[PDB]
Write a protein that binds this ligand. Structure first.
Ligand SMILES: Nc1ncnc2c1ncn2[C@@H]1O[C@H](COP(=O)(O)OP(=O)(O)OP(O)(O)=S)[C@@H](O)[C@H]1O
Ligand SMILES: Nc1ncnc2c1ncn2[C@@H]1O[C@H](COP(=O)(O)OP(=O)(O)OP(O)(O)=S)[C@@H](O)[C@H]1O
Ligand SMILES: Nc1ncnc2c1ncn2[C@@H]1O[C@H](COP(=O)(O)OP(=O)(O)OP(O)(O)=S)[C@@H](O)[C@H]1O
Ligand SMILES: Nc1ncnc2c1ncn2[C@@H]1O[C@H](COP(=O)(O)OP(=O)(O)O)[C@@H](O)[C@H]1O
Lengths: 562, 271, 548, 91
């Protein structure tokens, strides 16, 4: 009656059929057996990153013992699930946990060597001290108890390898994660349990799509359960949709629906409406950027390829660098793109390369090495991208930072890899890197394509995609630019109930004054402000203007007036 | 040190008796704790003499093994060759660079013997795994066939090929095993016959049959011995390569002897 | 049922109705009942701020259970609460064993509920949990959960998070108007929708410590109880709640009203109560701040970027100290950063602090770390003319887009702050060459984005009496511990002007010059005698100096 | 560096990759030797190695393939043959 209230019987549990049908992994079961059948120091310890099935092997061994498929000196051993959470728990006196541990050990060693033991997460064995989890160390190194264990890499290194004289009595069985094919096998094996739990049906194409997506989009957890969780989530959602609501099985696109419902990635198979928007892109993007027909087509084709299913899965979704004269709409094109495929202008990650004129300032987007001031905080860019793995990175005017920051993008591009302080890795495989510039400044396409070459390197220009050149502002279209600006102003005038009656000559004089050939449309927003907003502010707080009045404007011989 | 506490009261009640040498108290503790627990209490450490124990070399580990090579050979119903001892005592020092010599060497020999005993069980390795895999692919192709779907057409057409091409290898390994199992009747049967020839030479010399004495000593008996020798081999006792298989399965560095399964791959590496 | 003495039920008392209906938040209930219906990673956890409705959601689910609407899997399954403040060194694990064994031998799916279990988690419930016999539904706050369930847990693989941030004004209004009759029979006075919405908006705006769904109910019930006790007005109204909010915070019921007209019309001498003279400057600044919050300027700009220079000691800072006082309800808000050390090319990184891993990183920049917290300050800039022509680029970036970047990586926001760039230029010119020097020294286009560039007008030789008079009205409070009143006499008071001006640092010394003199010259009388608390202490102008 | 005779096999490898990546939507291509050698004939400028060939494959096949694929008419299954034209190549 000693190991009767501090232990269960995993073997009897498996006999009652209430365990899951492990599929595969015969190498590791054979290794565990040929270790557990030794003469002295027979204690295997299953080691591997968390989630890959380190207990499943022990349930497999239990099932195999119950079925009778083991060698001669392993039949009828009744492996036991020991636990220490219920031995060190209730004890407030001197030497009380010792009586329980000694009773358990005594009950083991009285019976013959047929009580093979199993402590899970045995990194909880070194504590209990205050000379605990240490008296248990003579029996270990003599083959009295077997003590199958299971611990993560991190916990193992942190808790045991500081106690070398105890680590010697153990044996490691590196349980590596399985590949996609083995994952599909395991999923197909387990399908029936969930198909019975949730009264639905599950398709093999759905299983394959789950095992393929859960490897390309959730790159922080591991496979044999990262996949199963999606199937469970989709089955539950379909169940809830069936019930409570006055073509009843999961499909290979509900899994994509889930894996897009979190992580934000739009991974799917082009459900309806989305295709209409993509086909209707060049023009839908034109309402915010007028001109530059050459560039919009390129970015649009990039998005089209990436979401249609023809694009190298391990490389960014595009690495464009467009440059041209000042004030033409480069940053504005990038912002309009981000507004298109997010409808959130502040959901992109822009970094101003104008600040990094100094060498050492690169540490902000990387981090600091171990042993320095800001280490546990990480890197700005890496932190911003590790979450929200769908943003649109931007590099404002990358001509200032002296030619050393060009040696981080050099491998950010072409692989979507980056490593921060802690030694982690992040994936840029589904972002759109965009980096403007101002080389040229008037020169022809063959006088700026020399500036690019003489400023950057071949190893760099070879990485990024087409080098788009931006044309100059056509003297005609500024009427539509002023139209856009007045529309934005009217949108700002919506808390009240004002409108405007802008006249054609006023609009013409506006587009005529404040577009000097060297700076483009930049001195236009400030002019609109100082010529409309302030004039109205002096005219609203002092009467003579009230909300509702369709305020007209005039083209008086002097500066514009109402 | 901390026998019973609450403020030190216990664990030093033997500190007076130690000095006068009443009790003798031989003890053995690790090295990176004698300066973590005891050395902190130099009032008590003073009563202890230290006997540093350095790790032995390969030449002495070989002897330790040669002496210990009976307990395992008995506990497992197998035999062990001295080549295995030497190869283990060498590889355990070359590759497993985390533990110390008298133990990481014995572990290899022990695991090798355990595996060999597990193979004298019903079937040897490299066939049980293939038959398990065949049964898996069978139970999978059976339940994937009833797919009222179209995406299962090209996914099932390859599973049939894989099942067939693994069952072929199963049958081939089976036939080779039956050959090697039926080969140990003649080689040994001749002796069952060779022993009869030795009785024949005994009786030839009993009867004064000199003519048969040499006909058996230089004819029949040696001729039967030569017949067994016939062709030099390219499984009842461990060898100096099962050690390599263990050191490859653990600390996954591959250190076998290029068992003809991949030497073609190595000679092909370029193309 | 053996040890049900540290546990309360939710379905039993639901069979009577001693709970409150929780109309609203019907998404969270569906999310929870969906999570609790899986096979792995079930038993969710509710994550949100305190008093947000964590207990309200689980009770609403309990009531939907006792009615019967959920899937029949979860149907016919009760819930039991737990209180951990009753369990707690030791024997807490013993009672934990008792209750867990009770649940275990119950042999069913009797769901549990453990509030603020971040004190419980340890290794004693995971072997029970990774077997599938119990279902625990917990709750805690966000950062706390991030503490006890991430570092020492290794259990987060079996807990599902659920987020409940906060209801809005319109939602808590519906909550209140749903929960009104209960009090109309508890006390019973009367209720008005005006009172409800006033409580909601005023609590949201000014009680910035607690949160909405309980904060509103607290104020409403307090006002109702006060108006029931007042009978020692048979309705509650907007004033009937503004009085309570005033008694709570300290700010009277007056200013707790419309915050645009009755405020932007107070830009009058309410400034001139602290500043003296310079009415032109006060009027210009008041117009600038009035028109800035109209609602037509761009949404990314400082609330004001004007500067004022000239003679010192006239109260240049005092204007700003009074300005921050009136607007942000505090004069300990402005932050003065001298532009003196910033005379070197490299030291411009001092007010930001660029890299992680170098000398000044943890201290942050002088400007940002004092703005990202308290984004309501009024930054001052002494001797803007001596700052190197590189910080002006930073200033440009500030007043061209209301944001900036520190070194840590954060983004600081400037769209509701006020910039003030003091100086000392214009020592010789009245209004003719001072503007030319300001144009020539600074970049003449950077000044364009600035607001009015007014210069403080000198102090009238008469108009030092007003400043010194406010000074005397103040210092009259000093000796209120013994009620010794003070004398006034134009010869004496004007005697301070010509002997305390010293026109190179205005009235800097005009506080110490008079305080040390009068105080420490009378401090001996205050111990010897000669005065008691009705005496004018007549101080006179002796032939040379100020004796008594 | 690379020789124009060596870029043909690189073209073959890139096309094998693209077909293996397309086999996820049960498509495949049939490329004619005209286009197969045209692509390598556009492996110009022996200063940028062999990446221009990859960007060329993208710009010349992937954009049109996606444009067709998300506009109907290329429903899953049937293979499409690519055939050269005077300057570009059509499908
Ligand atoms: N070979 C396998 N056969 C069947 N199910 C498997 C297999 N490998 C993994 N699983 C399932 O995947 C999940 C893995 O869970 P566990 O292995 O119990 O977790 P774990 O391996 O112990 O990792 P930690 O350290 O406990 S978080 C379970 O749902 C298993 O049923
Ligand atoms: N085709 C266009 N469509 C819409 N707005 C345009 C267009 N061309 C210019 N603009 C406007 O021009 C102004 C400047 O655009 P930006 O892209 O922000 O300047 P920029 O391209 O970053 O040039 P630099 O080198 O960075 S100063 C914005 O107000 C744009 O709206
Ligand atoms: N949707 C709702 N329907 C009905 N009552 C609500 C609703 N939301 C909030 N309440 C009431 O507001 C109160 C909130 O208090 P609690 O339930 O203790 O808050 P909580 O969500 O548990 O978080 P804490 O612990 O209080 S910070 C409850 O007493 C409810 O009666
Ligand atoms: N216009 C004024 N109104 C009120 N006090 C003033 C005024 N001008 C100067 N003072 C007095 O001068 C003191 C210090 O002036 P201050 O503004 O701090 O110096 P500076 O202007 O050189 O920065 C204030 O505390 C106040 O007592």
């Amino acid at each position: 009656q000693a190991l009767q209230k501090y232990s269960t019987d995993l073997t009897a549990r498996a006999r009652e059929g209430k365990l899951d049908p492990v599929i595969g992994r015969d190498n590791e079961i054979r290794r565990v057996v040929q270790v557990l059948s030794r003469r002295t120091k027979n204690n295997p310890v299953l080691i591997g990153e968390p989630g890959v099935g380190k207990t499943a092997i022990v349930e497999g061994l239990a099932q195999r013992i119950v079925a009778g498929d083991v060698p001669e000196s392993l039949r009828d051993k009744t492996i036991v699930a020991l636990d220490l959470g219920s031995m060190v728990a209730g004890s407030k006196y001197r030497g009380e946990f010792e009586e329980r541990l000694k009773a358990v050990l005594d009950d083991i060693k009285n019976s013959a060597g047929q009580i093979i033991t199993f402590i899970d997460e045995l990194h909880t064995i070194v504590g209990a001290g205050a000379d605990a989890g240490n008296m248990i160390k003579p029996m270990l190194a003599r083959g009295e108890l077997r003590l199958v264990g299971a611990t993560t890499l991190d916990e193992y290194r942190k808790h045991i390898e500081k106690d070398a004289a105890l680590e010697r009595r153990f044996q490691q069985v590196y349980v590596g994660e399985p590949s996609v094919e083995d994952t599909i096998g395991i999923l197909r094996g387990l399908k029936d349990r969930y198909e019975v739990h949730h009264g639905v049906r599950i398709t093999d194409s759905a299983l394959v799509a789950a095992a393929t997506l859960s490897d390309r989009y959730i790159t922080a957890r591991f496979l044999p359960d990262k996949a199963i969780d999606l199937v469970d989530e989709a089955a539950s959602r379909l169940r809830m949709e069936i019930d409570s609501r006055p073509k009843e099985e999961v499909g290979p696109d509900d899994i994509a629906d889930v894996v897009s419902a979190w992580t934000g990635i739009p991974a799917g198979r082009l459900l309806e409406g989305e295709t209409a928007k993509l086909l209707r892109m060049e023009d839908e993007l034109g309402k915010r950027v007028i001109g530059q027909k050459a560039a919009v087509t390129a970015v649009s084709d990039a998005v089209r390829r990436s979401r249609a299913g023809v694009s190298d899965p391990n490389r960014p979704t595009g690495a464009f660098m467009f440059l041209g004269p000042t004030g033409v709409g480069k940053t504005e094109l990038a912002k309009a793109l981000a507004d298109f495929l997010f409808d959130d202008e502040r959901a992109m990650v822009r970094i101003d390369m104008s600040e990094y004129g100094e060498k050492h300032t690169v540490a902000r987007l990387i981090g600091a090495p171990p042993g320095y001031v800001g280490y546990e905080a990480g890197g700005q860019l890496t932190e911003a991208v590790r979450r929200r793995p769908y943003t649109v990175v931007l590099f404002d005017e990358i001509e200032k930072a002296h030619p050393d920051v060009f040696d981080v993008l050099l491998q950010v591009l072409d692989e979507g890899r980056l490593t921060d302080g802690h030694g982690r890795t992040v994936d840029f495989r589904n972002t759109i890197l965009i980096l403007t510039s101002n080389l040229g400044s008037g020169g022809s396409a063959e006088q700026v394509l020399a500036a690019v070459r003489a400023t950057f390197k071949p190893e760099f220009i070879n990485r990024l995609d087409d080098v788009l050149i931006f044309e100059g502002l056509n003297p005609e279209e500024l009427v539509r630019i002023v139209d856009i600006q007045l529309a934005q102003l009217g949108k700002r005038l919506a808390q009240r109930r004002l409108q405007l009656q802008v006249s054609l000559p006023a609009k013409r004089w506006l587009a005529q004054r404040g577009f000097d050939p060297v700076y483009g449309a930049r001195p236009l927003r400030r002019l609109v402000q100082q010529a409309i907003g302030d004039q109205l502010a002096k005219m609203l707080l002092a009467g003579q203007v009230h909300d509702g009045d369709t305020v007209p404007v005039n083209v008086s011989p002097d500066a514009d007036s109402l | 040190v901390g026998a019973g506490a609450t403020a030190m009261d216990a664990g030093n009640m033997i500190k007076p008796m130690l000095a006068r040498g009443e009790l003798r108290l031989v003890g053995a503790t690790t090295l990176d704790e004698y300066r973590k627990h005891i050395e902190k209490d130099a009032a008590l450490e003073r009563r202890f003499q230290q006997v540093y124990v350095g790790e032995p070399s390969v030449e002495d580990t070989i002897g330790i093994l040669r002496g210990l090579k009976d307990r395992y050979e008995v506990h497992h119903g197998v035999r062990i060759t001295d080549s295995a001892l030497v190869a283990a005592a060498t590889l355990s020092d070359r590759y497993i660079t985390a533990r110390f010599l008298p133990d990481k060497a014995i572990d290899l020999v022990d695991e090798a013997a355990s595996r060999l005993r597990m193979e004298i069980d019903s079937r040897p390795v490299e066939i049980d795994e293939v038959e398990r895999l065949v049964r898996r692919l069978e139970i999978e192709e059976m339940a994937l066939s009833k797919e009222e779907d179209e995406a299962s057409a090209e996914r099932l057409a390859k599973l049939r090929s894989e099942l067939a091409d693994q069952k072929e290898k199963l049958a081939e390994l089976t036939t080779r095993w039956q050959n090697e199992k039926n080969a140990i009747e003649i080689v040994r049967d001749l002796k069952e016959q060779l022993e009869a020839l030795r009785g024949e030479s005994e009786r030839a010399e009993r009867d004064g049959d000199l003519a048969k004495a040499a006909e058996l000593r230089y004819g029949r008996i040696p001729e039967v011995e030569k017949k067994l020798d016939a062709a030099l081999p390219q499984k009842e006792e461990v060898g100096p390569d099962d050690i390599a298989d263990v050191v490859s399965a653990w600390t996954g560095i591959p250190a076998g002897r290029l068992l003809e399964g991949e030497t073609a791959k190595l000679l092909r590496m370029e193309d």
